Amino acid sequence: EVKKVVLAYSGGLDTSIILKWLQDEYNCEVVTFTADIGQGEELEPARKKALSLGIKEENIFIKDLRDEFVKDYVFPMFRANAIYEGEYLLGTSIARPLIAKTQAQIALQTGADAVSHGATGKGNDQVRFELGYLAFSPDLKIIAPWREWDLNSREKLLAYAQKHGKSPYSMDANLLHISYEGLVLEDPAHAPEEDMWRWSKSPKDAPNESEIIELDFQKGDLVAINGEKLSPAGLLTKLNELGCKHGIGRLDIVENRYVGMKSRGCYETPGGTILLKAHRALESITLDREAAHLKDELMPKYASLIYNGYWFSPERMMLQALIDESQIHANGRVKLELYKGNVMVIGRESANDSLFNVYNQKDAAGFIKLNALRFIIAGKNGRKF
Amino acid sequence: EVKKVVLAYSGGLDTSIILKWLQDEYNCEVVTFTADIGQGEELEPARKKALSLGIKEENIFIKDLRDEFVKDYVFPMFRANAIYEGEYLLGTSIARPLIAKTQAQIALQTGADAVSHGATGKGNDQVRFELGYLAFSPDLKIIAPWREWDLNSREKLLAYAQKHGKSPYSMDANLLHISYEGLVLEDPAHAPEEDMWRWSKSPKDAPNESEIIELDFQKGDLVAINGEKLSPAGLLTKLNELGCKHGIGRLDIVENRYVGMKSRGCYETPGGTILLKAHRALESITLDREAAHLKDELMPKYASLIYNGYWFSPERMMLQALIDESQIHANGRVKLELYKGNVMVIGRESANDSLFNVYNQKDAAGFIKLNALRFIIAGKNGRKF
Amino acid sequence: EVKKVVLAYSGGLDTSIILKWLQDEYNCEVVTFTADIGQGEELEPARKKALSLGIKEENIFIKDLRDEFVKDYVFPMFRANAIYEGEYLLGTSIARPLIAKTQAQIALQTGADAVSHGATGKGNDQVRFELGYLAFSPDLKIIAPWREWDLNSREKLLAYAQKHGKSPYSMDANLLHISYEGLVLEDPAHAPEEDMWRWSKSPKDAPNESEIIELDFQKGDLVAINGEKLSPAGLLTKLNELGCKHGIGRLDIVENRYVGMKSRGCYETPGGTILLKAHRALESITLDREAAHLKDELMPKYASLIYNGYWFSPERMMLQALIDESQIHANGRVKLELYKGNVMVIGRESANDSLFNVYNQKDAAGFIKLNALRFIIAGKNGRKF
Amino acid sequence: EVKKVVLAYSGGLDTSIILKWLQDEYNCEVVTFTADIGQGEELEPARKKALSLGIKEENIFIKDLRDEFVKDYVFPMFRANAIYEGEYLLGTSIARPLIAKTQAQIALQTGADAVSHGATGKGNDQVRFELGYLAFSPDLKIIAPWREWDLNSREKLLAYAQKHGKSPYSMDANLLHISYEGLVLEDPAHAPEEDMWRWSKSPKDAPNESEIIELDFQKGDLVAINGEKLSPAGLLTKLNELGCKHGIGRLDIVENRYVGMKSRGCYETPGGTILLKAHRALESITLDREAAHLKDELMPKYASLIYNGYWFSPERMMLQALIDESQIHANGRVKLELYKGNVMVIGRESANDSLFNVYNQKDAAGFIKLNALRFIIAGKNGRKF
Structure with a gap:
């Protein structure tokens, strides 16, 4: 009842x-x-x-719920550089x-x-x-x-x-992406028809003039674009328009579903495609090596959790705590050039948090000697390659 | 002595x-x-x-050693979709x-x-x-x-x-990439000068006409391009020329070194950039989900091993055995459109190994019920979100 | 029909x-x-x-199917030191x-x-x-x-x-373990009754005289006990009798099930408890450090696969290939003393594969200097602890 | 200068x-x-x-620094069930x-x-x-x-x-362990002499009467023993005396060092050996399955960090944040029986946080059907086992 x-x-x-x-x-x-x-x-x-x-x-x-979507869901996920199966930016999930x-x-x-x-x-x-x-x-x-x-x-x-x-396509749209399934897309051996893409220009129709943009980050999250401080939805929207203008963010994959088997879909993630590239560049000068590498190792697990519907789970909260801790000093600025589908990093800097900022050759000799010990012990034990 | x-x-x-x-x-x-x-x-x-x-x-x-390089080093690494820090294709390493x-x-x-x-x-x-x-x-x-x-x-x-x-740049070149360091690149906040790039056209100078290519794979390795069966060096060279022609494969990063700190470099990986995209597409229809996901989880560790100089190590051989086992049924064909820096997948198919190829809604109900059990037990125990 | x-x-x-x-x-x-x-x-x-x-x-x-059970299922799993939730030796699974x-x-x-x-x-x-x-x-x-x-x-x-x-208990018995559930065990706050344990003596009833045993391994698998080469079932049976005699292998846990929630069970794994200890000792002198550590990192995932029923899956075959590759040089002998529930290692040796088998203090200085670089860069960047 | x-x-x-x-x-x-x-x-x-x-x-x-040692170093590590190479409780590290x-x-x-x-x-x-x-x-x-x-x-x-x-042994002693190296221990094929062990009774000299103890936990840390709330050093000391009395915590391993090769050592970890067993039992009724399993997967990496000297590192802080988040609801009581080297769990309970606390057989049918899909798709594609 x-x-x-x-x-x-x-x-x-x-x-x-x-x-x-x-x-x-x-x-x-x-x-x-x-x-x-x-x-x-x-x-x-x-x-x-x-x-x-x-x-x-x-x-x-x-x-x-636009601001809250970007603030408490989208930005937190991007801290991890989350990407599912090396391609999918998880817009639906x-x-x-x-x-x-x-x-x-x-x-x-x-x-x-x-x-x-x-x-x-x-x-x-x-x-x-x-x-x-x-x-x-x-x-x-x-x-x-x-x-x-x-x-x-x-x-x-x-x-x-x-x-x-x-x-006529089965679509899912939000501030992060537009999804397409059905029709010709049903055959993964068949190319999509051009008139399907509703959001972004194709790289062919994108302007012949590249555009420079500057993205400011605070603790791993986007906070400004070309000096402009917008609301979270405001920021992602601006990146979307930039991505759409220049034909950025299109994707054609078959993916493994949580329920059922494989499915072919196309995706437009203009703003998010730019976000990921910039966020990596930010981390490259501001994150400790092992902290970055540890987060890379745990990213696919995190991406699958999101994909499968386990955002609100103890696992994911544990992984988020790890992810967020990595982001404390992720403050700085990235410069990118957009041109017909391309997101090229051309600069990154940080005012107080760059680790790009003594040791000599004799020091390096000793580092090598101690890493090579196991190889010498092994070699003497018959285990030569 | x-x-x-x-x-x-x-x-x-x-x-x-x-x-x-x-x-x-x-x-x-x-x-x-x-x-x-x-x-x-x-x-x-x-x-x-x-x-x-x-x-x-x-x-x-x-x-x-060109053929052997691609055959026993390059192709084996690409089975893993190895990428270092989400960008670097490990050409030097x-x-x-x-x-x-x-x-x-x-x-x-x-x-x-x-x-x-x-x-x-x-x-x-x-x-x-x-x-x-x-x-x-x-x-x-x-x-x-x-x-x-x-x-x-x-x-x-x-x-x-x-x-x-x-x-005038400090360069490392091989069949997989060309590396650039030094000069203006020293400042990571400074863009590279255009005349530095020696191998690939820029996407701006790349042709206004897209090009379709078909790549055949056998057990995870490239074996043919547009129906043409070439030697391993032959294959990678062909992909290079295609990538260069269309301005594909450029990269601008600071990376964490094994020895010393952070370093800014530019890289041209025309053929390899295309290889990675195609290899993912191959796996997307031919690999079991959990097999693909397991390899994704172990990829960064594998990439760091390669980067740091541990190709010939017990670890890496262990990881390779896992990686290779994932590749047994990775046979098929991928179709891509190249245009000014873009590598777009437009088709993938497989003659005998596609898993893209009964269950109903009541079955899905029971799958949901059992995954949701822990959430209901938790909720009753005060752990509501 | x-x-x-x-x-x-x-x-x-x-x-x-x-x-x-x-x-x-x-x-x-x-x-x-x-x-x-x-x-x-x-x-x-x-x-x-x-x-x-x-x-x-x-x-x-x-x-x-006793020999085949130990040969193609039990021994292969023990190569990984598989243990579920740090306690359960997976006898049913x-x-x-x-x-x-x-x-x-x-x-x-x-x-x-x-x-x-x-x-x-x-x-x-x-x-x-x-x-x-x-x-x-x-x-x-x-x-x-x-x-x-x-x-x-x-x-x-x-x-x-x-x-x-x-x-009167709900039991599962095989060459690896005996399982108990039901009755008083239903309350995890209640101790088991002594007369429940059907296979092993309690440590209290176990002899006052310790017993030395020597276990020979070949490629990570048990092959002999006190110089005696037995069939696989033969070997595990012998270890069982030794374990039972000395009151070894009892366990009291609640575990997380794949289907449903938590369950309280008791287990007798006399032979397997001894096997695990010996196998670690074998690896300790015969395995490369990073090879051992890599397998440790992947063990829980492997244990869950086994537990959940995914022995015959692509994942598990991938993990097994990695595991087995780690075992190639796992040849040698371990000595243990058994006494009232205790499995103490007292010796390990290997005839051709021990890595227990130059570098100086200046070399160690350089190894330290290069590992400490990131800490000095960080310290200068305000990130002192 | x-x-x-x-x-x-x-x-x-x-x-x-x-x-x-x-x-x-x-x-x-x-x-x-x-x-x-x-x-x-x-x-x-x-x-x-x-x-x-x-x-x-x-x-x-x-x-x-006894209280601070246990409070801010020992207890935090035990939240992870940290154990190095499946044996070593990291007392020196x-x-x-x-x-x-x-x-x-x-x-x-x-x-x-x-x-x-x-x-x-x-x-x-x-x-x-x-x-x-x-x-x-x-x-x-x-x-x-x-x-x-x-x-x-x-x-x-x-x-x-x-x-x-x-x-005459080279020793390291603290509230967590006593370490022994040198002398006869130099040969890993040689058993230790009995008079070496200075802290704990042997299981042979341990009393013929078992002892029940109750351990209270709050957020994953020990807070009371037999109802007695002691300072952190107080608590670990009490567990030590209990462990020593009953001959608990002895260990004989060769371990892989960070610097140099393999080394043979003996260790007495009476209190910590009891702590680990109890902490697992606590988690078994109070932790969500996937949260526990995720922490298990990351434990060896955490153990190596500690071993190698990277307690004060960004990695470890990231891992700790994950670990600690898993511990929020780890409140409860564990009951153990100690007897001659044995730490047997005989009860665990929790006043407000036990998850031991509807679904039917038709629900389980649907859970099975959807997990088995990939196996049926694979089977039809020739990939039968």
Whole structure:
């Protein structure tokens, strides 16, 4: 039995169908939650769609989470130079836990005993949402209609819609990336069609004039661009526009999913692609060698945690504590030249934290002698190469 | 006391000075060893310079090691997607052990009791050479004149040269990369001058027409390019020309050295930059997820081993065994589009080894339920987020 | 639809009930498979029980797998010094894949289209079995009656038995260990009762006279005990008797399960506890430092793979290749004194492979100087501790 | 040139010789520093020896660091279950940085421009001291007379002593352990003689009556023993006496040194051996699985850092932050039975933090199905085992 559900609501047809199914099947009050995380969608019409579908005004939640997304999710991940399978900048994965947590809290606030979502019943996304929910409200009933209902025909789905009264690609968009799947992308041996890419110019259409930019960092996080101190969303947005302008950040991979097998997708990560390059350059003059190398060793594990939906887990908090500690002296400035898909570092400096700033050749002799000991012992023991 | 030394000889002024110092100070027979590993230098004049300096013909060793470099050093490293500090493709580091081993073997073959080299007395390179020597011949006397002699003035160096009778950058070149240090590069806050780059076109001078290429892989190694089966050096050379043509592979970093602190260098890795991208794409459809992820986790450690000069070590052999085992089914074809600095994957396929090739939503429900158990137990124990 | 099933059959009441349920519900021919892996049970009566229950003679499979268990499963794992959560020697986990693989092969051999087992529907064991099955025969239908049937009462279970015609602890026994769960052990705050331990003397009842033993190793594996070369099962059995005699190998832990939460169990691993100590001692004089340390770093991951049921996986094969490569020169002899629960190393030696077998104080000065560089650079940059 | 040195002074003959050599060779004022860290030596006579040797009263520093040793060095390390090469509890390694840091601070306080120590010129200990010094005072001149002086004869050492006016084993003792090297221990194939062990009873001489103890933990650290809340030194001392009484904590290994090769040593770690066992038991009911497993994976790296002398390093601080974060909910009580060398866990409980505290068999089916997907995809692709 269930009395009141918080639904992740986009205003789209499928979650509108879900909204009606909740009211009828579980016979409950539905609460809607719509979040701005850089989708580039007007929030208002969702309220109106929700109203026309029977939601009470007070049960309609519209929240702008752009700044918080970049501040408490995006920047913290980039401290690690997190990249999944050497290519993927985790744009979908990093955004999920922000949504699930916020939804869980609205549930708590409204007294709602259940939450719900329109994620696929066989994709990564259902896992990401539910792990998040249970981190913040482990007593919540979880309703995944895609997994529950008998509505598994298109015809039996259209019929239901009737009874209860853009780009052709399957897309996920936020301040960090735009994702594309479906259509020709289904064949990983087939190239994408050019008109699919909606956000960034191609490097071919990007300007013939390169552009220099300067990025200021404080404790590993971006704080200014060309001397301009913006809000976190402000900063990532600016980098996006720069990346888009110059055709930066496109990616074509098949990736291993947490749930199911391999999947082919394309991604536009204009700002984040620039962020990663700059952040490495920052660390290169400001981080102790072994501190940087230790974080490199632990990065893939961290990237998989994020990918798989384990942002809100003890593991990840442990890894974050390590990561953050590495970032204390990561203060400085990086200079980059952008040109048709290229992010070239051309300068890095730091006002108080550069380690780029006696020992002699006899000292180096002794360092070599002691590292070579095991090789001499081994050689004498028959283990010559 | 020393009777006979094998010297790494380039024909340059400094190693010519070293050659004379060996003959006089240690009072010995010098053996010269010059190797082609893609430097783009004629080998012959080194023999002639060596002759004019008093080396016996039979003590002059000129060897072409290009194929072996790519086959037994370069390709094996790329199986790991090895990259140092997220940027450096290890062009200098990977080449060193091939030279040190070959030098050690000429020493053994000729009956030479010592080896020698012109590497700096305070750089990474001396370590790389000596670790290698002692892997193959741990009884060898090692003579590092840069560390030993009293010739530490330029004036006292010119005087010695007299008594015993191009690009301004400090460069290291081989089939994998060209390295640049010195001059304006000394200031990491200063951009490089455009005329420094000797190998690759800039992306600005690269053609306005993109180029498609197809790369065939067998067990993780490149075997063909556009259907053409070349020798290993042949293959890497072809990729180099493609990379150079399209302005691919440039890099500007400060890196942490094994010996000493941080150093600013620029690198041209045209072929290798393309290789890495393609190799990831190959693995993306042919490697089991956990096998790929495990290798990712161990990559930085492997990269540091290579960088620091530990190619010929038990560690690295252990890591290689793991790496190679991951590569057994890494057979297939990758398609890429090159354009002004960009290496875009546009297709990947495999004839017999693609894992891209039942479970339902109820199955996914149970997978979620069991992963979420610890979160529910934790939540009940007060550990809600 | 299913025609013929291979059942893991012990002759016990529950798998006898399962055998009858298979014949009736799936309406098929049942094949029985009983394996000796050190349970200390006579195999014969299982054949007779199977006959009385309607199994054809030719569908009764009785196999002795003791030698193979130790040779291809136990010894390979011990090369890694595998221990789960710093205590558990994986006795149950390591035995499972041998059973699942053998069962899968009998299935293939007999033309059987399904396999089945009596493992709990909510324990670790079902996972271990099924991962194994699908490694060897991925087309096999898997029938887990504990998960499938409507027989979830004890009364409805007794009724079924009727219609189709020792220690009180829940135990798992093999050549490596005996496991105990249930009864008083359910409370982790409660001590076990003394009469539970069936295999080993307590240290209190163990003799007042210590015993010296000598263990010979070849490539990391035990090959002889006190000069006696035995079969692999022979060797582990001998160590068991020695361990039992002296009250060695008892353990009391709660452990984290793969499936479900935490569980309290007791374990007797007499031979394996001695094996681990000796194997470390062997490595201490025969393994290169970094090779040993690298294997230590990767051990927990390897232990979890084994625990969770991923013996037959690409990951584990990769890790094994690394592990085995570390073992090449692991030849030698270890001497230990056993006394009332204690395994004390008192000697280790090696005939051709000991690295226990010049450098001076000035050399050490230079080694220190170069390692301390980063600390001096940091100190000058304000980062003093 | 050097004016004033802080010397690590024990009052022994060798550091008394060093004290006189400093005054004469560097022609400086010597400051003495003697620390109590559990050596079981009276501190007073060191002051008197120092006075008779010409040290000013105000330049004699006698400090009790027992509580701080356990609190800020020993307990923090045990949070990680740190053990080196699977055996060594790091008693020497963990104590060093406390001494080096304190010495560096006395140097700073007194205005001393140099520090000095009597550590061997070819052992691990010189490295540990100097890394520590430079963490706290990177400008300090470091004087290692063992590496510097021409006093490398015993006869030329006795002559110097004259001119300027117990157990036979080489031992290191502190609150955590006693170390033994030298004499018969030199041959790793030779057993130690029984009269060498000075701290703990042998298990043979240990009482025939077992003893139960209860250990309370708070955030991963010991806080009480049998209900008794003691100071940190107080706690470790109590555990030592318990361990010694029952013959617990003896160890015989060859270990790999940081500097030089392999070395054979014996160790008595009575309290620490008990601490480790109890701390694992605590974690077993209070730590999330993945948090515990992640810390296990990173333990050897952490142990090597400690061993090699890198306690005061960015790496170690990063690892500590991770380790400490794992310990937040590590509150509870462990019960153990001690008997003749054995540390048996017999109970563990926690008042508010135990995770030992719904899902069904159908849920487990779906968890299995999704983990087995890659095996089925692989099997269909020819990769059957």
